[PDB]
Design a binder for this molecule. Structure first.
Ligand SMILES: [Mg+2]
Ligand SMILES: [Mg+2]
Ligand SMILES: [Mg+2]
Ligand SMILES: [Mg+2]
Ligand SMILES: [Mg+2]
Ligand SMILES: [Mg+2]
Ligand SMILES: [Mg+2]
Ligand SMILES: [Mg+2]
Ligand SMILES: [Mg+2]
Ligand SMILES: [Mg+2]
Ligand SMILES: [Mg+2]
Ligand SMILES: [Mg+2]
Lengths: 387, 387, 387, 387
């Protein structure tokens, strides 16, 4: 039951199952994983592929000779398992040089280094077949008001992304970029803190078609936002290039729980939306097996990510296919929501006395929306508590 | 000291000082105010003008004859005081017909009514000289997942705003629209919940130049966001058409405290940003004098709004003009943040060995940012605790 | 399937299904319900009983003759249905006189009135058979720091509850009191804001045995707290006298969604705890059918409250009875958690070299907790996705 | 201006100025500090003393010979500066053995080790003159529901604190214990998450007089709570044994900003309360200089902690001494709040017709509370914007 296969497109960051368990108050509880072992174990669980930061795959400061050997071993593990690499990203946050940011560091020479580090890994990402290059600006922001002029910082951020777009264009690469928002942590406030802020920023880039979002369940929930709603707006804009799936219990530090944990009903509505919209990208998990766990718990937590997605996929499909639900959707006028408000045009609307002068506002107000019965059918379907 | 005058452009909604004190758990504590008295009393306090919902000025369901008399009295009070009306808006949230929204109600006939109600008040707003027409979609959203298909809802929302833009264009009106975001309340989740989501939505409208944002201090803080940061992004996009000033204590119900209350330091950084950027629009207060207060407390609370803005304006100006602060800003490389990262171009950056191959990452990492000393100078200036 | 009966002890406030839908931004969407109709309709759904504020049952300002007639009709509906009244409470928050509180109002004459109003309704509650008298101090608190000296306010609060305990003792009543915490709304901050603060306050009362807590799901979640954890501490203290069941989506205004909505997994763990601990009190719903709904939606939402409790009861029982779960609980050392740490005593612990000098800290640290596998078995049981 | 001296009782944890800047996403940005240098530099800034975890002072795993030498050097630095050690604590959270807790770890042998580790450091704390021994149970809690039976965990927690009380009693030590609450991080939910939960727990200990709270500004604010209100309840209970001062911007990860940063007005009301109540304990800073800073920024941030306390002390004293404020406090009936509600007794209250039958509820409701004018006088005093 609910067994994932590579055709389900489930992917995992090397940094996820490979997290050694260091947190702000605690030392590692697990030994480091060889990327080759993660590829092997994830393939055995039914994963489709992996993703990486440059520094997850090649230790920072590696010589060219060491760099070549790390990539060669990794490619052999991919070849031996059929695993893919659909996405890569740059670590612009761990090294102390990035303490005030990469692309928006106050120090200009750090901003130039951040771009050179990113460009080097874009080449490698293309080599390994990645279709999406993610940017998580975790250090872009501030703890205090005078430290960061945000208009200047957004100028620098646009400059950086424009240069990266110029680079991929000049090389003929087919890879696209995805900005991963986060509202805070590790900076007190992070720039482009939500899906909305990232979508708006992209529209000011020189080549907007090259950039989308990589929203993460837990990050929008750290702002108390409705993650399915934000995904809907990203899809509406044509910008859901990639997605990070995990769990989060409300407004607190970034928990990165396995997918399905945290807000279970939001996970249900998320899967319902991705499947209804026909999202065709990776189902990527950006999660951390809790540091309480040994390696057996690591793989159990990764397996649970995929299992929960498949259970929710089943229940959401059953919800939408249920004739009683389709009747309830009509009772709640979801069919009317999908119809144009005024396809007859502005002048016809202005001349339509049924839209104002003769609109029975009291009769309309008395019509119940029937949303609670619809939602209890959704609850029954989620819980397998129908007939 | 700190006495406002009309040239300070302070404005107030009729619904602010006129709030009778009804909350979810309590009846009114104050009698209704005649709009004429609010205009008179606000002018005596040094206000520049007022704003209104249609239904604040003309009671819902008024005949044309009653409507004309309400406007005539209001115009006489404006004429007798020199007060202006820079902004107006539509009440699309109080009447029960709007229980599932106005522009995105599931019922199509309600959406058409919402547009007709708005268009009627746009005409009146232009008559009274308003330059900005605000939309707060407080009922657009959902308490449950099946009740609202957000992609369909965003289609309906774009349709509505496009029709309104067609209308003002067809009439030759110079008024512009401003969307006021709010993340939640009274709906469980509201569509376009933050400044970012509204900015992104506007870029998909047919005539984007006609639409900006009207951000509110408390609303972005209900999502835990940095309000000065969001204003900076709105200014960066050229979309700060109007602003709502008030106070809020973190992530909870919408408090609408007087400006300066709530997050005092965020109020300081907000005023610093508006004045440095040269924001030229109204300094509008969307606030509610707490229902503990009688009418004397109402006017004291309104006076405090303007006083706190003027105190913060003084302290922020003193901060920026202090040579010791300018030195600290240089020590923290705010000057470097304002310089292009790579005006020499992509190829020059790729060929610059000082940006990668020869970049001393350890020496850069060792450079302290000196942000804490800068922030304590800011604190000293805010508190008047310098020399 | 999952059909409630009166033996399930489900109860509802008159103010819940009777909520007309007025919120801070909107007028009523439903007509007022006669308490007699609510009793009848709730009995038809399988409820056990109802609860009331004084002013829900007898309109404020009623004459003695009107008061007697309202109670007489209500008692006839209870008699005709078999419905009970296990709990009553006082409205100390709607009338404007309570704008700064009841028991902790700054005005002394208001505090005396609050006590007289409460005592009158305690008599009626005893008459109708209630075993618990709830106090929700929704107006006790402040929007500003100078307005309320909290130490003085806590003195006044202790005085009020002590007088009420003296009263019930003097009358020989068997009723007990339960304090319902809420962190905020309608006051900016409410006194005794969480289960913990209420439990601590009770220990300073003259007769602590007469007072417990009435925690509400949504209220602890408005502080971001774990509601099952707080219930566990209340049970540990012997103070879970009553409970309010509903749903809430994180840190925002008090939503009062139907039970099972909001945080579904917290609802699962809550039911698991109440049933395992043998909680014998009412399963009371303090919820508001969303104002989108007509009366049919009101009763569907109330029915969903009870259905969701019964589904979760089934799944939690299946979880605890599953031999594979019992094995996982042993693998995670939940059996060891239940054993005394040092029943051998302090001196034996000090002399036990295996507790320090010879404790292999590295071998202990390497033991995985196996919590993720346990939690995925819990998820599978909740979703009915086991065998 | 605002220069601290040792008589101001300002203290700092070794782990505060000594924080190397490692966060969940980043490596250290500063070298480790020798405790001797921190003592010297803090004394030069005007500090009164320092506090320590066992493992801050003596590296984990030290031999007795190394342990003696670390303490000897530390004592010489204290002797050479006049610095004191008023508080000590145990690190029960960094080492991987504590991944599921210390006192409430599921593994019994870990719980016994946690107690032995604590007892060893209590002896050292007494040796160094500490009057308070703090417990921060940062690992006590859970990420999932099945992992931790909270009633069993609270049994184990009571057992641990009771044994510690037995130990100090048996040794004749005068030191007392203080529990430091935190709602979450690094565990998904932490046991005893707020001041209220800790106060309530203490009342169930065998020797409650030996235990109080050590509340931290940022921790209560991570639950969205009013920190001055919680301190007031702790003082009301006689349990404010110690306090952690810092700054926090709302509901997010634990920021540990310098005191005065974050919620500035809450810092003002906190200082007003501590000084009015005559709190006589250490003014302890549990803060982290942001990792953007070099060592010069470390000492600037520490200096700002003390400066902000002294500025706020001045402004709060000026507020309370201002005859215009004293008049406003009377206008708002703060004098009536301090008077007993019914010193005439229950029967007199029941017989007082002015408390009910003849109480003019409308005249009382019409009395404005005048809270907004009072709060603007408080704002003017905080900002130095009076005469
Ligand atoms: Mg990385
Ligand atoms: Mg283009
Ligand atoms: Mg991610
Ligand atoms: Mg309005
Ligand atoms: Mg255009
Ligand atoms: Mg507003
Ligand atoms: Mg009531
Ligand atoms: Mg007793
Ligand atoms: Mg309740
Ligand atoms: Mg420590
Ligand atoms: Mg004792
Ligand atoms: Mg602390």
């Amino acid at each position: 039951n609910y067994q994932p296969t590579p055709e389900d497109r489930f992917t995992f960051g090397l940094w996820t199952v490979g997290w050694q368990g260091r947190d702000p108050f605690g030392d590692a509880t697990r030994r480091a994983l060889d990327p080759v072992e993660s590829v092997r174990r994830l393939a055995e669980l039914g994963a489709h592929g992996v993703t990486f930061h440059d520094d997850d795959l090649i230790p920072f400061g590696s010589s060219d000779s060491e760099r070549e050997e790390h990539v060669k071993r990794f490619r052999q593990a991919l070849d031996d398992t059929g695993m893919k690499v659909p996405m890569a990203t740059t670590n612009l946050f761990t090294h102390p040089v990035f303490k005030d940011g990469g692309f928006t560091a106050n120090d200009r020479d750090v901003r130039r280094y951040a771009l050179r580090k990113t460009i080097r890994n874009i080449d490698l990402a293309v080599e390994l077949g990645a279709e999406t290059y993610v940017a998580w600006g975790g250090r872009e922001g501030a703890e205090s008001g005078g430290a960061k002029d945000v208009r200047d910082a957004l100028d620098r951020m646009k400059e950086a992304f424009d240069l990266l777009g110029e680079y991929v264009t000049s090389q003929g690469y087919d890879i696209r970029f995805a900005i991963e928002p986060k509202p805070n942590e590790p900076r007190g406030d992070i720039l482009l803190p939500t899906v909305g802020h990232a979508l708006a920023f992209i529209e000011r880039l020189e080549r907007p078609e090259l950039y989308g979002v990589n929203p993460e369940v837990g990050h929008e929930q750290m702002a108390g936002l409705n993650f399915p709603h934000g995904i809907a707006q990203a899809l509406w804009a044509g910008k859901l290039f990639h997605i990070d799936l995990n769990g989060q219990n409300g407004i607190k530090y970034d928990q990165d729980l396995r997918f399905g944990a945290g807000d279970l009903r939001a996970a249900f509505w998320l899967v319902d939306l991705l499947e209804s919209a026909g999202y065709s990208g990776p189902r990527h998990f950006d999660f951390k097996p809790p540091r309480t766990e040994d390696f057996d718990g690591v793989w159990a937590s990764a397996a649970g990510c995929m299992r929960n997605y498949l259970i929710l996929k089943e229940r959401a499909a059953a919800f939408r296919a249920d004739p009683e639900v389709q009747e309830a959707l009509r009772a709640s006028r979801l069919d009317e929501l999908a119809r144009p408000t005024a396809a007859d045009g502005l002048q016809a609307l202005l001349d339509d006395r049924s839209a104002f002068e003769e609109f029975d506002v009291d009769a309309a107000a008395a019509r119940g929306m029937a949303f609670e019965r619809l939602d209890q059918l959704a609850m029954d379907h989620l819980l397998g508590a129908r007939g």
